[PDB]
Amino acid sequence: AISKEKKQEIIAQYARKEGDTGSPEVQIAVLTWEINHLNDHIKSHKKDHATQRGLMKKIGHRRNLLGYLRGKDVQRYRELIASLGLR
């Protein structure tokens, strides 16, 4: 939910490999971006429950995200806790 400049910008900073636009770190970038760039829209009127279900499937995408980058990979996130540092 962002333009191509901040899209490819946040790929550019928050990518750990050039061209790795499907990195788990870039899943953190766009997904962990639009959690708080999702909160703007839930606070927009607090009514769009379909977007609340988007938050459900994207919280779950964060669940597979760091459930996997803690799940099979471990230490490339253990060095990278301070990406945002959940929980």
Next chain:
RNA sequence: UAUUAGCUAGUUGGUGAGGUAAAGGCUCACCAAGGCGAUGAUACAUAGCCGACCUGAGAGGGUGAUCGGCCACAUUGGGAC
């Protein structure tokens, strides 16, 4: 039986001592606060248990009679030599 949820106070660890045939809160003193439990702990009903044995082709269901083993008991309850 979860229409059997939260439960547990010596409770759970540590130290000491008494005991014992012996480690052992086995007890008791003192100092620590844990621990269990919604993947069934406690509370209530019910039960002597097992080898075995009747039936079911077997899977099993069902029983514990009589026999043998263990356990428990000795009008009731509790101590202790």
Next chain:
RNA sequence: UUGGGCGUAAAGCGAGCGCAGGUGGUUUAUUAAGUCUGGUGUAAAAGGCAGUGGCUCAACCAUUGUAUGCAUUGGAAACUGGUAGACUUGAGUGCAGGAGAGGAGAGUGGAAUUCCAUGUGUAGCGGUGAAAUGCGUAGAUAUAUGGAGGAACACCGGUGGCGAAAGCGGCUCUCUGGCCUGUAACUGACACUGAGGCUCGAAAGCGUGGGGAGCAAACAGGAUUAGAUACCCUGGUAGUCCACGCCGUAAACGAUGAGUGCUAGAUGUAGGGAGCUAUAAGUUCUCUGUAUCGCAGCUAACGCAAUAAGCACUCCGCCUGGG
């Protein structure tokens, strides 16, 4: 379990998440955990499969063996598990496309209803099978206009789309998910689920505060007939609408859970991808969609059948004769 069913006969939660828990694309090697082999424990027994003798032979007893996760320990890498390892070839993320009643707010426009005055004229209108209901001569409806307000937005509109469904259609903005077509650019299995817990959610109604056209529970009046507390008519309260909280129950439906694999075809329609048919035309493949017939399969039958009631497996759930 062996050795069920769930479309209608009893049954799929009312739908979503993403907690445990369950299940695992391919491959390299280890591991032997489980898995198979050998040694070890095994009922004192009594008991079975046999034999012996015998109260004769009987029945059964006495005997004799046989038959056993009762156990622990060497091997097996073929599977799973684990351990390290690799690839994408599932998933998702990239770059291009579009699409829609997807949601949520912020506004706007017209028709139409009813009402305020209103031209100027006379009993009208109502309704049915008809009228009483009634209103209306205080002279109006109807017709001339302007105003007011709420509601909803005919062809658009469709087996159309989107949304998990519930549902969503005047128009315009705001920020807003979700797919599909292509794509390996990239992660390298991140997958599927889903008890628990959580969220959403018809329809009414309930709370507070508004808005109050038309409609209509409650009730009244008039037919109705034996009777009418009903169908009809005249009305007409709650309520319908707006912000703002709740119930959590609907034929929830398709009385057909979720994931993915397989495959006769005749067939709809979307919107892409590609060709395509060229001096403008019009065809073929591909994907998700949603029908209709019907191969196989299929059931008690009815029927289903590519968006299987056919053939499989993982997550769940239900179901046990009736009241």
Next chain:
RNA sequence: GAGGGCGCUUCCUAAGGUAAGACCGAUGACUGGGGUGAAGUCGUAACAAGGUAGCCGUAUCGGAAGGUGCGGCUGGAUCA
């Protein structure tokens, strides 16, 4: 003198009382529902488009079958 029973208090302490429950049974004036039997009486519904097709969840009015309304589906018709 030690030690010794008795001398000698305490500890735990069996039973009995206390209080404030909880559980579970029995029990109970009257009373709510349900089933059974009569074949009284009320009624037209539900069954055919079963006489207003319904069937749900819900609000609300009936002696009662039931009605009115919100919305939904054929397990519905003449065929719309």
Next chain:
RNA sequence: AUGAGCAGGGUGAAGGUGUGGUAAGACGCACUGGAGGCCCGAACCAGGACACGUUGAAAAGUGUUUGGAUGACUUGUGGA
């Protein structure tokens, strides 16, 4: 209108804060924290009951209990 007060002691909210709590809130327990027609209870202000007295100490009491006791309190002052 201006002033005066109304000993003490509990109670414990809200509020706030911080960590386990959470995507994030709701939650957990601390910490403040006292608001409160809160409570008890002094002064103070009443008068519920009871006894005494009632030609009474008294033209309305005493004595013992009783209530409120930070309020709609009590009440000075000076006014209408």
Next chain:
RNA sequence: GUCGGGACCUAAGGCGAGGCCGAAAGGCGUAGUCGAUGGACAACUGGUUGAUAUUCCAGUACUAGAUAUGAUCGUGAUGG
């Protein structure tokens, strides 16, 4: 002188020329005027009688003014 008041201000209020209305008396009321329970401000220790003490006096003040005395342009309002 210093304590309380007045010679300061002012609430609540009262009186109220003007003015308003009203048989009259009156009652209202602008300016203004008073009106403390309020707000303005210097003195406090010791002794002292039969009795007065912050008042009499020892010690220290301070406030305000006066006339006596090198200013210097300064004061600076009812206004702000």
Next chain:
RNA sequence: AAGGAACUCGGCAAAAUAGCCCCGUAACUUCGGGAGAAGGGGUGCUGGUGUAAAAGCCAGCCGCAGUGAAUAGGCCCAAGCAACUGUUUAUCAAAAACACAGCUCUCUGCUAAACCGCAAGGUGAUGUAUAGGGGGUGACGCCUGCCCGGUGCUGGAAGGU
């Protein structure tokens, strides 16, 4: 004494309990409370040791009695009424009476309505319909049914008066 409420219309008065600490605490609940529920225990002194910041320990000494006296709740069950706190006849009566938030209706667009005064003037209130005035009822929960004949009120005007 012994006995208890048998007295009485009535445990009326007296009695008895209460302090502080520490346990523990049913019912319903509007979830705060109830509740100090109840019921229970302790409470003196001596030396220690730990109490000074600080109880508890140990032993003993004692005691009829250990907040040695004073001072300081009787409790429980249930029902009706009223919610409550407040206020209430001083020279009788404190309550179920009043009041109260609450809820309801109605009236008033402003030199308000309403009210006081002959008026003037002023309140209402330097108020503007969430305010002001009147009427009902008195939290919270459920609910408020029917009847416009009559009365009153409102509104309308055809005619009578």
